[PDB]
């Protein structure tokens, strides 16, 4: 129920999402989506603001998050990016869901 | 794009969350959490802002959502209260995630 200890909580969420525990679904989000390499046609038109956990990690370490709601919007932006671009039956879409399940729960248990 | 079209889409989201299709996990969220009746100790302590689909439905019928974000914020709040109050291995937590999956996806597919 404070900023400095809430941001601590979000750091906690970040570490969990990046831990070896969640590696088998989390791995597409470790780094910025490489649209060229993966052949994602029009990825940069369809997707206004890219976001991944490495970006989130950086703003966290440089202390660029002013509050928790902001952390949240970036994390959800990252998943929404995935859901927007991809067909519902896409493998990565299932993976976004499983990681987001982890996100939403620990985020709900915030002070 | 603009608020009018977005909200139309949001209502269609709501409709889907209320349809028969999702009924076997959706049903806990149809109405406000009756803390008394379910014997949820301290629910109103723990949960500052109750939210359910009837409250969302009402605001939509009444045109009380100014933009799509405001719809998202209520629907996520409804899920968040669930994950906040309950233990992780609660049936209702499992049902929330299954419905949220339907929310997050179709919401990401907004024009
Ligand atoms: C670490 C960033 S990376 O770019 O360097 N590597 C990378 C590698 C595989 C990926 O996808 C798959 C994942 C899991 C599978 F089982 C199959 C996949 F194809 C994606 C990926 C990410 N996201 C957010 C998408 O929306 C998306 N759409 C289409 C691909 C993707 C990114
Ligand atoms: C809609 C009017 S109602 O709200 O009054 N009815 C109602 C009935 C059952 C419920 O839960 C169950 C779920 C799945 C089962 F298999 C068994 C259950 F009992 C909940 C329920 C809701 N929510 C948001 C919670 O956070 C929560 N925590 C503990 C219970 C709940 C609410």
Curated annotation (Swiss-Prot), chains A, B:
Changing residue 33 to A: Abolished binding to histone H4 acetylated at 'Lys-12' (H4K12ac). It comes from the Eukaryota. It is found in: Nucleus; Chromosome. Belongs to the BET family. The first bromo domain specifically recognizes histone H4 acetylated at 'Lys-12' (H4K12ac). It also specifically binds histone H4 acetyl-methylated at 'Lys-5' and 'Lys-12' (H4K5acme and H4K12acme, respectively). The second bromo domain recognizes and binds histone H4 acetylated at 'Lys-5' and 'Lys-12' (H4K5ac and H4K12ac, respectively). Some specific inhibitors of BRD2 that prevent binding to acetylated histone are promising therapeutic molecules for the treatment of cancers or inflammatory diseases. ABBV-744, a small molecule, has been tested on tumors with success: ABBV-744 antiproliferative activity is mainly restricted to cell lines of acute myeloid leukaemia and prostate cancer and is able to displace BRD4 from chromatin. GSK046 (iBET-BD2), which specifically inhibits the second bromo domain, is a promising therapeutic small molecule for the treatment of inflammatory and autoimmune diseases. This is Bromodomain-containing protein 2. The lineage of its organism: Eukaryota, Metazoa, Chordata, Craniata, Vertebrata. The gene is BRD2. The chain holds residues 347 to 454 of 801 of the full protein.
């Amino acid at each position: 129920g404070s900023h400095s200890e809430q941001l601590k909580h979000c750091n906690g969420i970040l570490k969990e999402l990046l831990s070896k525990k969640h590696a088998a679904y989390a791995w597409p989000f470790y780094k910025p989506v490489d649209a060229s390499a993966l052949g994602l046609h029009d990825y940069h038109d369809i997707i206004k603001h890219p976001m991944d956990l490495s970006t989130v990690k950086r703003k966290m370490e440089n202390r660029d998050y002013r509050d928790a709601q902001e952390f949240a919007a970036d994390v959800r932006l990252m998943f929404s990016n995935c859901y927007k671009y991809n067909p519902p039956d896409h493998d990565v879409v299932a993976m976004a869901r499983k990681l987001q399940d982890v996100f939403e729960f620990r985020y709900a248990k915030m002070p």
